Amino acid sequence: ITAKPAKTPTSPKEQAIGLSVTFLSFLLPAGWVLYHLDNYKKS
Amino acid sequence: HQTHAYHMVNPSPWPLTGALSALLMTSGLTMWFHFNSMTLLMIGLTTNMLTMYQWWRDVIRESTFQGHHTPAVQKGLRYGMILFIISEVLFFTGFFWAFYHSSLAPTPELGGCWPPTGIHPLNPLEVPLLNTSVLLASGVSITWAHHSLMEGDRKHMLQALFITITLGVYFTLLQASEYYEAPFTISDGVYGSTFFVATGFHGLHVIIGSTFLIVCFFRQLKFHFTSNHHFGFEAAAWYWHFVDVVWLFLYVSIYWWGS
Amino acid sequence: MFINRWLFSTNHKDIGTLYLLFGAWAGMVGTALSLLIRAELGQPGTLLGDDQIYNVVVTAHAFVMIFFMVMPIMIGGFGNWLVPLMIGAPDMAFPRMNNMSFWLLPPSFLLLLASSMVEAGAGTGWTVYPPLAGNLAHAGASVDLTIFSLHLAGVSSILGAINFITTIINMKPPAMSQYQTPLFVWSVMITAVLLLLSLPVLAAGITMLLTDRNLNTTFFDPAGGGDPILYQHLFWFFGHPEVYILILPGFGMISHIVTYYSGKKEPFGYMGMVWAMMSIGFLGFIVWAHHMFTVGMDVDTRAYFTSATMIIAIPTGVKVFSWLATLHGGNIKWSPAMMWALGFIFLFTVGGLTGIVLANSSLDIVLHDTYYVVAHFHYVLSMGAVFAIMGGFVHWFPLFSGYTLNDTWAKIHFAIMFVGVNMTFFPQHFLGLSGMPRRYSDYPDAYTMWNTISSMGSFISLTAVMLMVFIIWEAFASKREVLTVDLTTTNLEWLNGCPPPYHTFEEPTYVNLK
Amino acid sequence: STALAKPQMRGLLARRLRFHIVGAFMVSLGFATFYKFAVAEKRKKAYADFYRNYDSMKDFEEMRKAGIFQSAK
Amino acid sequence: SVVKSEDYALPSYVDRRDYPLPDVAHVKNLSASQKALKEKEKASWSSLSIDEKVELYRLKFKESFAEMNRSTNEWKTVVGAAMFFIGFTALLLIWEKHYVYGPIPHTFEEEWVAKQTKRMLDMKVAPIQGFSAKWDYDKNEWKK
Amino acid sequence: FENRVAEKQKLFQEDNGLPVHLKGGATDNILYRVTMTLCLGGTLYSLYCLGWASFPHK
Amino acid sequence: ASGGGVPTDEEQATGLEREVMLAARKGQDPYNILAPKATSGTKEDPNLVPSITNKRIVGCICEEDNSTVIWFWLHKGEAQRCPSCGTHYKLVPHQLAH
Amino acid sequence: APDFHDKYGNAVLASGATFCVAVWVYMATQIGIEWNPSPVGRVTPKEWR
Amino acid sequence: MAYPMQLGFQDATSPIMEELLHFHDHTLMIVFLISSLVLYIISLMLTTKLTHTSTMDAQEVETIWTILPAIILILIALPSLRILYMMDEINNPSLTVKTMGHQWYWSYEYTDYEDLSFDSYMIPTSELKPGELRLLEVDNRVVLPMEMTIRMLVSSEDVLHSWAVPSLGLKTDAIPGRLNQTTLMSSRPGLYYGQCSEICGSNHSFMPIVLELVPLKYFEKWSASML
Amino acid sequence: KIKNYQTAPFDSRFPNQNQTRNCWQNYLDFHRCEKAMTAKGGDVSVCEWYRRVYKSLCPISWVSTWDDRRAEGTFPGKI
Amino acid sequence: HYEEGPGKNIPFSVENKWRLLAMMTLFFGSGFAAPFFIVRHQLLKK
Amino acid sequence: ASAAKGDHGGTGARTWRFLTFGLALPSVALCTLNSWLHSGHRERPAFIPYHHLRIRTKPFSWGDGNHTFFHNPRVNPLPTGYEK
Amino acid sequence: HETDEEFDARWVTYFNKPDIDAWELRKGMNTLVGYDLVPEPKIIDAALRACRRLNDFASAVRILEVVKDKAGPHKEIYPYVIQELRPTLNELGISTPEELGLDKV
Ligand SMILES: CCCCCCCCCCCCCCCCCC(=O)OCC(COC(=O)CCCCCCCCCCCCCCCCC)OC(=O)CCCCCCCCCCCCCCCCC
Ligand code: HEA
Ligand SMILES: CCCCC/C=C\C/C=C\C/C=C/C/C=C\CCCC(=O)O[C@H](COC(=O)CCCCCCCCCCCCCCCCC)COP(=O)(O)OCCN
Ligand SMILES: CCCCCC/C=C/CCCCCCCCCC(=O)O[C@H](COC(=O)CCCCCCCCCCCCCCC)COP(=O)(O)OC[C@@H](O)CO
Ligand SMILES: CCCCCCCCCCO[C@@H]1O[C@H](CO)[C@@H](O[C@H]2O[C@H](CO)[C@@H](O)[C@H](O)[C@@H]2O)[C@@H](O)[C@H]1O
Ligand code: CUA
Ligand SMILES: [Cu+2]
Ligand SMILES: [Mg+2]
Ligand code: NA
Ligand SMILES: [Zn+2]
């Protein structure tokens, strides 16, 4: 396939930001629940 | 401007209202069976009925009034109704399978016999034979209706279709009376379970098919059908023959062989 | 405008977009349930301290992945986007019904989430066998809410199957016979005929479970003369067609992706590939009791089910060999979609082969209800389906969005996923042969090492899933618009540009007879 | 200078295919042979040799004296 | 030379080893020297210089076979980055061991295992191949 | 009865840009608003009921 | 025994369904219901492809029973050839509803 | 003209492999995970009754 | 029982189980060969610059690739069905024992002569004696005579369960209202473990089976003492 | 008199894995016979074989529910 | 008519990449987080 | 079979009306007489509380929980027997 | 199908057509390189002469590159073919891709 160059290039720094927020968005809420399992298990 | 013959449908809200009426009907049966309340179920049955009415009203606007059913569109609808009726045949097949599984190898809790000890089956030569004659009769009159329509005879299409609907209603009243009179119930083990769930779902399809022929009757009274284009009447007749065929298998299997 | 377009749609591409988004969000729910399973198992002892919860999470993981992730993506998503374009049709036969099959899914999913939130959930297995799923061992609304969730999902799919069969049979150019239609459109036709005939039997079975739980029927209760084994027959009569329905549209996509990236105008042995899919769909109706070899079955019936099940290897082998003969002589482009298809071909073959071991009822006595069955279906089903899905998605994403992905990042995603799934499932074979049961929340200590490695594998596929969400973001963030695409002469869905206009084939294609 | 001799120019992909499919067959035969001796016969012989002079009462008596049984002390 | 979205329905240029003569020339608008070069091409090609020959090739084609077929270092970035994210997953599993999992059962203690192991060899677990088969009951030691 | 389909054909083919489900007039809008009110209000009520049923009432 | 009162399509068919019926009567196919029949497809006797715009997709089934169909845009102007079999096609644009 | 892979590929390979090996070795050996390997050749059996 | 890092089947305790081990070795050889052939052909398809992209004729090759797989299946089916019918053949047992599943423990009935029955529950981890196996031991084992054909009948008093002993090649679902029959014969004395193998609710993982195989005269005396 | 019972032998009437009907048939035969004997003033001793067979095969809870339902008058087989 | 074209044939905006990052985070993160929270809810009921 | 009648020159509206009134509806009339002639209440059987009948594993969602939906007091006993 | 000799003659005749057009030259070469063979010198000779009649130097060079590419790892085949065409290359003033530096990456 061929394509145009990006209309809104996403630089390495912007990719690190997108990847980090994507990762925290799945890791943090599950991490919180699992960290506190014992507070639930005997709550 | 298209230059094929198929129908691009206007954006419509009926799919969403029909999906939500499904969530309310099922949420509502849950509420009725567990939280002692009929509220959600009644709102869902009401939305279901409004959805069906507006959706099929709009198919009639599209075809009779707007002219969107070209022969290609109509052939697609023929396939859709045949594949629907095959799906309903497979649904009844699950119920016949449960029937033969239970009655061909009756367990010791039953007395090891069929019909179970303590079950007194209806006599298949009484009302069940009558109901058989009534549905077969209505298969002959709906065929009279169809030929009168193809032959351009308005009054005799109306009379034959009325007679067919009157027979469907008579079968429904008969079956209601049989259910009241029956000495066994749905809680009478697997005899009651197979008998009432399999004939009850058949009865429900008799009510749906009768309602469909009643819609065709009012469409014919308003001149919607032409002598050559009348697919809603064909679909209603194929469905009504389905209902008759399912009844013949119920009568032979459950009422006659299983007695 | 927004509501008319996205809630009242009658357009096959938008509705297909909706199903891709739905299925992607389902796949996150499913993946999180799978990570909970493997966290409970990742070391000996109890994590959740409540095995009724562990059974609910296992039951939900399978229904979400099967009914809310695979079927919506493959048939609702790729089916609706691609089948009309591949046959030059202006939309599906029933464009407004098509929108009800999509909208029944969010309510069906809400009912399943309701089932897990009320009472103590339905901790039944996705087979929902009575009497555990009955009203004494699972009293309360949860199993009924699961039964309704499956009813709404069945009706969505039976109506989708009527629409796809009619569209495919009625809406091709007048010169194009069925034997001029692409293999993906055949794989969809055949999946739809399986849906049409199998779903109504599962609706009969689960409606009888519903009446046994609420109306005092006794189809499956021996006290009234019922039989729990009758449920298993009606469940599996649907359930074996269901597994071929999960893979058939994956086989269709794979034939297109391997043809395309081998630079070929056509798959090898097209009519052999049509025959093989029809044969697998036909034999898929006469094998189901291989799911029941330990219920107390007569020896001649075990013999018949063992032999009929194995026969499926013949047509499936013709398709594996034909994909290899399609790569043969190709100018191979090693694009990320090609990697996903070649991973499919190898990992699907492994799983199909462990299926053939299980078809031998004498070995199945020892292997039934152990992790060897779980390893089987996570290779052929979880990996074969998911890898055909990922290969489809990376292949066709520039068609549906108009934008390109970063191919390097997509290769990276492939590599990480390939390591993860193999680390997670491959040791489950050893667990199975050495006798670890499925559906357990903890195991005898001897099974620790393989469980520990399988749970570490599951985290590797999680890192892949997170990465994939970033990869889609980056493509939409960067906005590299497509310019040119090769082999449009044998890939009609790309010839209207990327994305194609809302209405395509308003003027139909011209195809002569001659 | 020396002219170059004419090489085989036709069917080179097919030729390569036939060579390696034959090769893969030979290797398959090799492996079947290795496997029947490293695994399958190995197993038959382990079982056969174990049971050849096996004395089940003696094994039971050793188990009983080690204290393993509920029904035998 | 610029390719536009609105050109999708027209034949386009591709460099593919298996489609060596594409449907259009790489350069469609020529300079006046390029045009005269095309005129010169209609006379004996022995009169064209090497540079003119190269230029006629480059007006017709974008990349040569050697160029389009070249290998790249992308595999290093792919394999490296896949290793980096696999390494990151181990950070997740260190966090889960530290913060989520409690103690394993006491049956994994060294002394329990030693006793349990004796009791497996007392009951001759897997005596033919798998486990007791590897113990020497005469010498009272694992078989060498 | 008399055949008045041609009147209806004129009505529903009027070039007024209305989608078919509202092209019969004001009565269509009212029926549409009843149906959608009941569906959306019922759906909010079923979410309330799940909220209620999600917790033990002892 | 027999009477009338049911409309005929001649009387009551409307919209596109009426257009297709009236066109079929004149033996025409403005809505592409039929498969066109091939010409010899040479440069002198090209397949003639009607369009209401300036380009139309053609699928060419190069030999009877091929399962592979070859697809390409055919543009107004000089005749174009199938990229597989070389058969010629020429676009004949315009019109429909008068 | 160097792309990303020509300029960064060797670094990405080298550090990604080093990092991956280091952190998995540490996770496998330093944090108390019980792999439960075979007793064969490793455990001295001890009286239990 | 299984042992740490095990890859294959538990060693065989009954001659049916040894048959299955040899049949599995034969089938696994065929599975490795095919999977390794497909992986090899894939690598071969992908490792040449030579091309051939024109239409290829498929009927010659589809013969080999339907007949060869059919022969391999018949070569699995033949030993496979031999075992199946062999296990099924008339045995004459010397003893019948019934087991009933419950949520979540098993009971056993040995009522050929006297009325003997008892319940058998998992030993909780905190109550295990040194060296005993977590999740596997029970309070009351199923003591049985070694070297004798026994008929086990299996049922349930509540939901489904399944009664399994992998070293003996046994797994028979336990279904309320049904009496499923299987035969068991141990070549050796010892302790053989298994675990419930049909999901039956929150303690499915915690209702194991332990057989204790001993000479007949010990079995007679143990039976007498359990009355 | 014709004894040395060890367990119920193979019965070609019930050759397969589900033995429910074997248990049930021998329970019915026992009680039918015992009924025949007790009535016609003969001796229950001749009914022994069916007694031994259904004792060996039938779950105790089945036998005990079926004895209760005979006492209750709700046993569904014919004796 | 409706908007056509890249970025316009979808029910979410891609006009700003950071606002898109937030919408995608909430969309996929809410699917992923749900089962953790449903297990918390069932452990908290007893 | 051919039935025992004849027509086939044409199966049109006239023929199917002839079958409707000449065979189908006379059949229904005969069966209606046969039924409404073996009608008349038959003597209800002695109640026996068999455990495979009158099953109650959950109360019904209507009435007192213990009556079936088309409960007929004359012929449908409850688990504890016929109603007063 | 046909003998090697027949196949080669058919392709010689295709490219030797005096008024072959540019569409036909491309169709020919792009069809021919789909086959499992490196085309014989005589076939390549005729296609390079079609290039001459069509005034197309660039396509003649690219035809030489594709002969090399079709030989894959059989490195003796391309020099043999160039050897064989040398009288033609000389007569028509066709420089090889190597002589033009187009083999360097
Ligand atoms: C993830 C950790 C794994 C730990 C490994 C073993 C530990 C050794 C202990 C220590 C070794 C000491 C010797 C003790 C011998 C025990 C004998 C026995 O009773 O034997 C029974 C055993 C025999 O098992 C073995 O003899 C181990 C061999 C493993 C199979 C070969 C593939 C190697 C896979 C690579 C690693 C896994 C992930 C990739 C696998 C990719 C998918 C298959 O159990 C099986 O039945 C497992 C196979 C399941 C069947 C699926 C087969 C499909 C083929 C797989 C692809 C092959 C072609 C590609 C060729 C391979 C190219 C990739
Ligand atoms: C994508 C979904 C999918 C697919 C396609 C398959 C395909 C097959 N599966 Fe199944 N299967 C599952 C999903 C799938 N399965 C699931 C979900 C379960 C568990 C359900 C539950 O309990 O939850 C399951 C369970 C299951 C069982 C029950 C095991 C048990 O519960 O004890 C069995 C038994 O026979 C079985 C067999 C097979 C076979 C023989 C195939 C065949 O179709 C495979 C054919 C493929 C090949 C053989 C490989 C390709 C072929 C060649 C390279 C040619 C040469 C090969 C030979 C000569 C052998 N599968
Ligand atoms: C004259 C024939 C007309 C039939 C219809 C009449 C009644 C109410 C409406 C619904 C019809 C539904 C069809 C069948 C469903 C189940 C049982 C119904 C058949 C019936 O009516 O059976 C009655 C029992 O009804 C009962 O429980 C009634 C319980 C009513 C609640 C129905 C429960 C809803 C459950 C249905 C779920 C449907 C799932 C559908 C799947 C769709 C596919 C996805 C029998 O009466 P009885 O007093 O036991 O015995 C007679 C003694 N004198
Ligand atoms: C107490 C009463 C409530 C009972 C509960 C359930 C409700 C009853 C529903 C009864 C079904 C009514 C269907 C009416 C359809 C009217 C629309 C119609 O018939 O539409 C026709 C197209 O057919 C078409 O769509 C064919 C469309 C066919 C629809 C078939 C529907 C069957 C529905 C079953 C639903 C339940 C499932 C069963 C449960 C297990 C329009 O084309 P023509 O007729 O050719 O007219 C055009 C000519 O005039 C031109 O000259
Ligand atoms: C299967 C998917 C799961 C994958 C593994 C998840 C990886 C974990 C990512 C981190 O998650 C967080 O980590 C914490 C600690 O590291 C938490 O803070 C807790 O820990 C503290 C420090 O001990 C306190 O500062 C806080 O109150 C807090 O609740 C917490 O809330 C949480 O969001
Ligand atoms: Cu009992 Cu699982
Ligand atoms: Cu199956
Ligand atoms: Mg099971
Ligand atoms: Na655990
Ligand atoms: Zn062509």
mmCIF file of N, CA and C in Angstrom, chain C residues 70-71 74-75 187 190-192 194-195 198 236-252 276-288 290-291 308-313 315-316 348 352 355-356 359 376 380-381 385:
data_model
loop_
_atom_site.group_PDB
_atom_site.id
_atom_site.type_symbol
_atom_site.label_atom_id
_atom_site.label_comp_id
_atom_site.label_asym_id
_atom_site.label_seq_id
_atom_site.Cartn_x
_atom_site.Cartn_y
_atom_site.Cartn_z
ATOM 1 N N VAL C 70 -15.908 -12.941 19.253
ATOM 2 C CA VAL C 70 -15.656 -13.550 17.932
ATOM 3 C C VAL C 70 -16.781 -13.386 16.961
ATOM 4 N N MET C 71 -18.016 -13.792 17.340
ATOM 5 C CA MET C 71 -19.068 -13.779 16.341
ATOM 6 C C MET C 71 -19.336 -12.312 15.855
ATOM 7 N N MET C 74 -16.288 -11.259 13.529
ATOM 8 C CA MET C 74 -16.100 -11.961 12.262
ATOM 9 C C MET C 74 -17.368 -11.744 11.387
ATOM 10 N N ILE C 75 -18.569 -12.034 11.882
ATOM 11 C CA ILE C 75 -19.708 -12.062 10.966
ATOM 12 C C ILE C 75 -20.394 -10.641 10.985
ATOM 13 N N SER C 187 -17.444 -18.464 2.988
ATOM 14 C CA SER C 187 -17.212 -18.894 4.367
ATOM 15 C C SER C 187 -18.358 -18.269 5.173
ATOM 16 N N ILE C 190 -21.809 -20.235 4.465
ATOM 17 C CA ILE C 190 -21.819 -21.529 5.126
ATOM 18 C C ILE C 190 -21.960 -21.354 6.648
ATOM 19 N N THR C 191 -21.284 -20.344 7.246
ATOM 20 C CA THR C 191 -21.433 -20.037 8.737
ATOM 21 C C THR C 191 -22.841 -19.704 8.905
ATOM 22 N N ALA C 192 -23.450 -18.921 8.019
ATOM 23 C CA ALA C 192 -24.892 -18.511 8.294
ATOM 24 C C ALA C 192 -25.861 -19.706 8.233
ATOM 25 N N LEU C 194 -25.112 -22.756 9.107
ATOM 26 C CA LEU C 194 -24.930 -23.413 10.392
ATOM 27 C C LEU C 194 -25.686 -22.664 11.539
ATOM 28 N N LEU C 195 -25.647 -21.312 11.547
ATOM 29 C CA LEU C 195 -26.314 -20.495 12.607
ATOM 30 C C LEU C 195 -27.775 -20.810 12.503
ATOM 31 N N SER C 198 -28.575 -24.385 13.794
ATOM 32 C CA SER C 198 -28.055 -24.857 15.155
ATOM 33 C C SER C 198 -28.697 -24.013 16.317
ATOM 34 N N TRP C 236 -25.118 -29.566 22.850
ATOM 35 C CA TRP C 236 -24.001 -29.888 21.930
ATOM 36 C C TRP C 236 -24.433 -30.012 20.495
ATOM 37 N N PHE C 237 -25.697 -30.357 20.252
ATOM 38 C CA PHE C 237 -26.169 -30.439 18.823
ATOM 39 C C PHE C 237 -25.929 -29.019 18.241
ATOM 40 N N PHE C 238 -26.200 -27.988 19.048
ATOM 41 C CA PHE C 238 -25.767 -26.609 18.676
ATOM 42 C C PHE C 238 -24.302 -26.360 18.835
ATOM 43 N N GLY C 239 -23.717 -26.918 19.884
ATOM 44 C CA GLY C 239 -22.370 -26.518 20.323
ATOM 45 C C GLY C 239 -21.290 -26.963 19.372
ATOM 46 N N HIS C 240 -21.471 -28.129 18.760
ATOM 47 C CA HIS C 240 -20.341 -28.485 17.788
ATOM 48 C C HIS C 240 -20.463 -27.571 16.479
ATOM 49 N N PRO C 241 -21.702 -27.440 15.867
ATOM 50 C CA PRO C 241 -21.776 -26.421 14.766
ATOM 51 C C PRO C 241 -21.183 -25.058 15.197
ATOM 52 N N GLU C 242 -21.449 -24.598 16.446
ATOM 53 C CA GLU C 242 -20.948 -23.309 16.982
ATOM 54 C C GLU C 242 -19.382 -23.251 16.830
ATOM 55 N N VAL C 243 -18.673 -24.365 17.052
ATOM 56 C CA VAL C 243 -17.200 -24.176 17.011
ATOM 57 C C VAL C 243 -16.810 -23.999 15.563
ATOM 58 N N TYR C 244 -17.503 -24.626 14.633
ATOM 59 C CA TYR C 244 -17.102 -24.446 13.173
ATOM 60 C C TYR C 244 -17.588 -23.024 12.772
ATOM 61 N N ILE C 245 -18.719 -22.594 13.251
ATOM 62 C CA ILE C 245 -19.133 -21.185 12.989
ATOM 63 C C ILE C 245 -18.089 -20.189 13.484
ATOM 64 N N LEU C 246 -17.429 -20.520 14.615
ATOM 65 C CA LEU C 246 -16.369 -19.556 15.138
ATOM 66 C C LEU C 246 -15.152 -19.550 14.201
ATOM 67 N N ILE C 247 -14.858 -20.604 13.527
ATOM 68 C CA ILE C 247 -13.608 -20.588 12.750
ATOM 69 C C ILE C 247 -13.870 -20.322 11.223
ATOM 70 N N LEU C 248 -15.068 -20.716 10.670
ATOM 71 C CA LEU C 248 -15.243 -20.648 9.234
ATOM 72 C C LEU C 248 -14.960 -19.262 8.605
ATOM 73 N N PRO C 249 -15.491 -18.180 9.195
ATOM 74 C CA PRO C 249 -15.198 -16.878 8.570
ATOM 75 C C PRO C 249 -13.671 -16.526 8.724
ATOM 76 N N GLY C 250 -12.956 -17.164 9.694
ATOM 77 C CA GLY C 250 -11.487 -16.999 9.933
ATOM 78 C C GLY C 250 -10.884 -17.710 8.776
ATOM 79 N N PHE C 251 -11.403 -18.869 8.412
ATOM 80 C CA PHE C 251 -10.768 -19.616 7.228
ATOM 81 C C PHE C 251 -10.966 -18.725 5.963
ATOM 82 N N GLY C 252 -12.116 -18.147 5.781
ATOM 83 C CA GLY C 252 -12.347 -17.221 4.635
ATOM 84 C C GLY C 252 -11.327 -16.106 4.648
ATOM 85 N N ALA C 276 -14.376 -28.066 0.655
ATOM 86 C CA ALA C 276 -13.888 -28.349 2.048
ATOM 87 C C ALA C 276 -14.736 -27.618 3.054
ATOM 88 N N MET C 277 -15.022 -26.333 2.835
ATOM 89 C CA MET C 277 -15.909 -25.641 3.782
ATOM 90 C C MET C 277 -17.329 -26.213 3.875
ATOM 91 N N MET C 278 -17.891 -26.630 2.723
ATOM 92 C CA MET C 278 -19.264 -27.228 2.761
ATOM 93 C C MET C 278 -19.142 -28.561 3.477
ATOM 94 N N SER C 279 -18.104 -29.406 3.189
ATOM 95 C CA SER C 279 -17.980 -30.692 3.871
ATOM 96 C C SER C 279 -17.864 -30.506 5.415
ATOM 97 N N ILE C 280 -17.087 -29.533 5.872
ATOM 98 C CA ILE C 280 -16.815 -29.352 7.285
ATOM 99 C C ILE C 280 -18.152 -28.868 7.839
ATOM 100 N N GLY C 281 -18.898 -28.066 7.084
ATOM 101 C CA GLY C 281 -20.135 -27.575 7.715
ATOM 102 C C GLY C 281 -21.182 -28.723 7.833
ATOM 103 N N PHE C 282 -21.220 -29.616 6.870
ATOM 104 C CA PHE C 282 -22.119 -30.783 6.910
ATOM 105 C C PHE C 282 -21.733 -31.825 8.002
ATOM 106 N N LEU C 283 -20.444 -32.208 8.066
ATOM 107 C CA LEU C 283 -19.975 -33.136 9.104
ATOM 108 C C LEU C 283 -20.041 -32.489 10.456
ATOM 109 N N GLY C 284 -20.066 -31.171 10.555
ATOM 110 C CA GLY C 284 -20.161 -30.493 11.840
ATOM 111 C C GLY C 284 -21.521 -30.718 12.509
ATOM 112 N N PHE C 285 -22.506 -31.327 11.828
ATOM 113 C CA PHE C 285 -23.832 -31.617 12.429
ATOM 114 C C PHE C 285 -23.975 -33.082 12.950
ATOM 115 N N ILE C 286 -22.988 -33.939 12.658
ATOM 116 C CA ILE C 286 -23.199 -35.362 12.963
ATOM 117 C C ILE C 286 -22.068 -35.879 13.926
ATOM 118 N N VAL C 287 -21.438 -34.982 14.688
ATOM 119 C CA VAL C 287 -20.314 -35.379 15.577
ATOM 120 C C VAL C 287 -20.507 -34.955 16.999
ATOM 121 N N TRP C 288 -21.591 -34.302 17.447
ATOM 122 C CA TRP C 288 -21.556 -33.607 18.722
ATOM 123 C C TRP C 288 -21.358 -34.416 19.911
ATOM 124 N N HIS C 290 -19.159 -36.415 20.687
ATOM 125 C CA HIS C 290 -17.797 -36.490 21.201
ATOM 126 C C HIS C 290 -17.616 -35.530 22.415
ATOM 127 N N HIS C 291 -18.614 -34.654 22.685
ATOM 128 C CA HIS C 291 -18.575 -33.869 23.920
ATOM 129 C C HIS C 291 -19.122 -34.650 25.147
ATOM 130 N N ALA C 308 -16.721 -40.585 12.802
ATOM 131 C CA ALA C 308 -17.250 -39.452 12.052
ATOM 132 C C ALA C 308 -16.437 -38.185 12.380
ATOM 133 N N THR C 309 -16.074 -37.992 13.666
ATOM 134 C CA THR C 309 -15.244 -36.832 14.041
ATOM 135 C C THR C 309 -13.903 -36.843 13.304
ATOM 136 N N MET C 310 -13.240 -37.976 13.237
ATOM 137 C CA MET C 310 -11.977 -37.888 12.575
ATOM 138 C C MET C 310 -11.995 -37.513 11.079
ATOM 139 N N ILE C 311 -12.997 -37.979 10.368
ATOM 140 C CA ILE C 311 -13.213 -37.664 8.955
ATOM 141 C C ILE C 311 -13.072 -36.159 8.742
ATOM 142 N N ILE C 312 -13.525 -35.279 9.669
ATOM 143 C CA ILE C 312 -13.337 -33.854 9.399
ATOM 144 C C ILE C 312 -11.911 -33.477 9.089
ATOM 145 N N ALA C 313 -10.940 -34.256 9.572
ATOM 146 C CA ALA C 313 -9.544 -33.863 9.229
ATOM 147 C C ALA C 313 -9.309 -33.835 7.692
ATOM 148 N N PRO C 315 -11.336 -32.870 4.811
ATOM 149 C CA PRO C 315 -11.524 -31.554 4.164
ATOM 150 C C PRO C 315 -10.691 -30.422 4.847
ATOM 151 N N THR C 316 -10.389 -30.511 6.149
ATOM 152 C CA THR C 316 -9.680 -29.409 6.774
ATOM 153 C C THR C 316 -8.255 -29.459 6.267
ATOM 154 N N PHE C 348 -3.349 -23.259 14.290
ATOM 155 C CA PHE C 348 -4.609 -23.964 14.002
ATOM 156 C C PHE C 348 -4.314 -25.469 13.730
ATOM 157 N N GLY C 352 -5.942 -28.401 15.797
ATOM 158 C CA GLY C 352 -6.776 -29.433 15.117
ATOM 159 C C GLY C 352 -6.268 -30.834 15.368
ATOM 160 N N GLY C 355 -7.296 -32.044 18.669
ATOM 161 C CA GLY C 355 -8.708 -32.425 18.513
ATOM 162 C C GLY C 355 -8.818 -33.847 18.041
ATOM 163 N N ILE C 356 -7.983 -34.239 17.077
ATOM 164 C CA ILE C 356 -8.025 -35.644 16.606
ATOM 165 C C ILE C 356 -7.651 -36.651 17.684
ATOM 166 N N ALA C 359 -10.737 -37.062 19.730
ATOM 167 C CA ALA C 359 -11.831 -37.787 19.026
ATOM 168 C C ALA C 359 -11.826 -39.249 19.321
ATOM 169 N N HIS C 376 -6.469 -27.861 23.644
ATOM 170 C CA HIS C 376 -7.020 -27.988 22.323
ATOM 171 C C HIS C 376 -7.700 -26.744 21.828
ATOM 172 N N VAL C 380 -6.860 -24.083 18.635
ATOM 173 C CA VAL C 380 -7.705 -23.958 17.369
ATOM 174 C C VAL C 380 -8.719 -22.865 17.393
ATOM 175 N N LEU C 381 -9.385 -22.667 18.541
ATOM 176 C CA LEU C 381 -10.348 -21.603 18.706
ATOM 177 C C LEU C 381 -9.729 -20.294 19.138
ATOM 178 N N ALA C 385 -8.988 -18.341 15.873
ATOM 179 C CA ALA C 385 -9.886 -17.216 15.668
ATOM 180 C C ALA C 385 -9.271 -15.869 15.855
#
